[PDB]
Amino acid sequence: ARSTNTFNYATYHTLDEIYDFMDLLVAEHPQLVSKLQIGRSYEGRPIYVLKFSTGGSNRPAIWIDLGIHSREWITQATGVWFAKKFTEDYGQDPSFTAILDSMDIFLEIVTNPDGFAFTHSQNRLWRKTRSVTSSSLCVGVDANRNWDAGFGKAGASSSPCSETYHGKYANSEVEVKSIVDFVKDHGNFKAFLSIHSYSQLLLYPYGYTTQSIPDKTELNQVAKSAVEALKSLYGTSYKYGSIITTIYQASGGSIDWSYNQGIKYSFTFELRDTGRYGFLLPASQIIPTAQETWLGVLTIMEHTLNN
């Protein structure tokens, strides 16, 4: 792709193609987008965040991360589509324009670059990082069980070979600490969205405790509105609720952490499908998935700008 306009959004890409895409986008919209390097992965790959902004100084912001579980390919694909969409819609869509005129958006397309490279090179179903454990032959940590939110509690595994291993200590994974430091240093995030696949769920905190969050009525109503919006395009049906009541107890998750940091609008999306294809969703479903997910995300951003 020589332009973001010639990039093929209807196919799955490699890490290099995605990183090149970032530079194309910055080159084409220098006034709206910038590429920030917030760290380096365990295997030394740069960890990039795209910042979308119309100006100001430390405007209230929205965090969006995709690909923390490497095999959920639909999420990185949706992330590239979102990046392009932001640049297309600014000045076109009255609602989205209103959002960018007052808030900044930080997008992390490939949150776990080492696992992603591995899914292309050796094992398509790899979901963890690629950090090497001391007293183990097993590699990697489930980065969505490594956050300081009920870390090590039930709903995570203490065995290194487990697909749900939580890691040695909270924030042991550089991929997670890089986000933690950035968000804490910024201090003006209002929303935190983490995108995964699959199951068609929109969840709010918590997963590590049965305790109800103080903002449950509001987040529940936002979730209902977001799922109604998403369903509107293709009729895709999502369920919504707190993590623990919807799925099961799960500790060390990112939205439990972000909520505990005071970022009220903390939600996780589990994208298509419900099991027919699971992690190997056909390339043909990339654009429709991205399109409907954008409506759900925009709904949350609108509430955020207003509240």
* Residue 272 in marked binding region: no
Among 69, 84, 128, 272, binds Zn ion (CB under 5 A): 69
Q: Tell me if residue 175 is catalytic.
A: no
* Residue 108 in marked binding region: no
Give the shortest CB-196-to-Zn ion separation in angstroms: 3
Q: Any contact of residue 128 with Zn ion (CB under 5 A)?
A: no
Measured between alpha carbons, how far is 207 from 258 in angstroms, rounded to an integer? 13
* Residue 196 in marked binding region: yes
Give the shortest CB-227-to-Zn ion separation in angstroms: 19
Determine the residue with CB nearest Zn ion: 196
Q: Any contact of residue 71 with Zn ion (CB under 5 A)?
A: no
Which residue stretch of 65-73, 88-96, 248-256, 277-285 sits at the interface with Zn ion (rule: CB under 5 A)?
65-73
- One of 108, 270, 292, 302 is an active-site residue; which one? 270
Among 84, 196, 264, 272, binds Zn ion (CB under 5 A): 196
Place of tokens 């390097």: 37
In the bound state with Zn ion, the residue whose beta carbon lies nearer, of 145 and 303, is 145
Measured between alpha carbons, how far is 306 from 298 in angstroms, rounded to an integer? 12
Q: Which of 88, 70, 92 is nearest to 28 (CA)?
A: 88
Q: Which of 69, 163, 65 is nearest to 108 (CA)?
A: 65
How many secondary structure helices (H) and strands (E) does the chain include? 9, 8
What is the β-pairing status of strands 189-197 and 61-66? parallel
* Residue 197 in marked binding region: yes
Helix-helix angle 15-28:113-121, to 10 degrees = 130
Measured between alpha carbons, how far is 174 from 155 in angstroms, rounded to an integer? 22
* Residue 12 in marked binding region: no
What is the β-pairing status of strands 46-52 and 33-40? antiparallel
Binding residue ranges for substrate: 69-72, 127, 144-145, 197-198, 248
Catalytic residues: 270
Binding residue ranges for Zn(2+): 69, 72, 196
Residues within the interface to Zn ion (CB under 5 A) = 69, 72, 196
